[PDB]
């Protein structure tokens, strides 16, 4: 019994890009949600299926923590029943999502003068990503009917595109650190409660 790992997810030095999103499993710890409250910095605290004021009286078998870095003007895509470049190729949440998603600002924690081109996202994909799936590939997208082998030219494009975060940049186009805590419940007995 110890305080849960919700101290490094929100305070890590390096954050993951959208396509290669890192996932943490949290189990066998006493839930300490007090850090989320009275923070005055979380610019988006939305919960789906469970209220945020009733988090301390609920039993959760497994808690999954997922972390991305997306553009400010597309945080709204992270929700059940939403469509877009992110919610259809990069990340996906099922229509019965049971968790809380949080996102704050990192205007000067990830941005550097001249542009931090580290963060990338999927721009081309054939189909719709299945929920809670991470498809990672470098295979070059074939837009036309002619098979393409390795070369990059017409009708043959790279799947990943980099962001352009900068110091003097608009609020909607500024980087955001977004965390998802899916409070999934399993038919197996709830080993951990509270």
């Amino acid at each position, epitope marked *: 019994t110890n305080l849960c790992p919700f101290g490094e997810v929100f305070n890590a030095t390096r954050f993951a890009s959208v*396509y290669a999103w890192n996932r943490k499993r949290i189990s066998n710890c006493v839930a300490d949600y007090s850090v989320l409250y009275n923070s005055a910095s979380f610019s988006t605290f939305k919960c789906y299926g469970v209220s945020p004021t009733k988090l301390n009286d609920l039993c959760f078998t497994n808690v999954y923590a997922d972390s991305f870095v997306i553009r400010g003007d597309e945080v709204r895509q992270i929700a059940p029943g939403q469509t877009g470049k992110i919610a259809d190729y990069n990340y996906k949440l099922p229509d019965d999502f049971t968790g809380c998603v949080i996102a704050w600002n990192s205007n000067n924690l990830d941005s550097k003068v001249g542009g931090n081109y*580290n963060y990338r996202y999927r721009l081309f994909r054939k189909s719709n990503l299945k929920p809670f799936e991470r498809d990672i590939s*470098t295979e070059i997208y074939q837009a036309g009917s002619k098979p393409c*082998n*390795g*070369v990059e030219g017409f009708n043959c494009y*790279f799947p*990943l595109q*980099s962001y352009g975060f900068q110091p003097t940049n608009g609020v909607g186009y500024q980087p955001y650190r977004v965390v998802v805590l899916s409070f999934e419940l399993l038919h197996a007995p709830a080993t951990v409660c509270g």
Partner: antibody
Amino acid sequence: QVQLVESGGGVVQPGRSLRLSCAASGFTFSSYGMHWVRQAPGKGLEWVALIWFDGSNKYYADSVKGRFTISRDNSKNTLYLQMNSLRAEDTAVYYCARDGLDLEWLFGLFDYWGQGTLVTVSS
Amino acid sequence: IVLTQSPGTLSLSPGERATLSCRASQSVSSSYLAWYQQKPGQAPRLLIYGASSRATGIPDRFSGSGSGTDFTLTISRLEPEDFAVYYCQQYGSSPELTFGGGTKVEIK
């Protein structure tokens, strides 16, 4: 079709500096990872260094860290590897390759190699 | 961290069947063992990645198989150009990037 060439090499007495260069073309040289694999004669391969897209995330090898610097230019399409305090074992053929992975979930794998350059260290 | 290839000198007549191995402890992360081909005096080229696949421009006569500790590379009837030294590599994570030794094949 990926083209990699190498420039720079020769004979240098131990205790000076040398600078390599690997120009590339045929693909976007801002979305792929670089490498440096060297080969002493008749012994085998060994990886040396790696650089990301932005040129800020260099991961050297255990036996070269301390006197090697890997540099990347994206406005010129040219890779670099500066060599300082050359020893006797440092003579080899240096190969520049291209990383064929996403560099975040996985890194490593080489898809296309260059040709190579002999460098000798003696007097 | 360490890689072993045996036998280092395989005597095989043209055609027939060939077998190689890249056994090593410290089982791979998921499936990350790659294979390379090196004709003499020329830069090496990749053949199989992911322990079972083919790179862009690898004929169907090269096949890869292996999971965990033991791995194999399989070639059908050898045309008189696939007689060179091959290399096996572990990739995927950390500065643990290591290459094997050498498994050149004899003509006769």
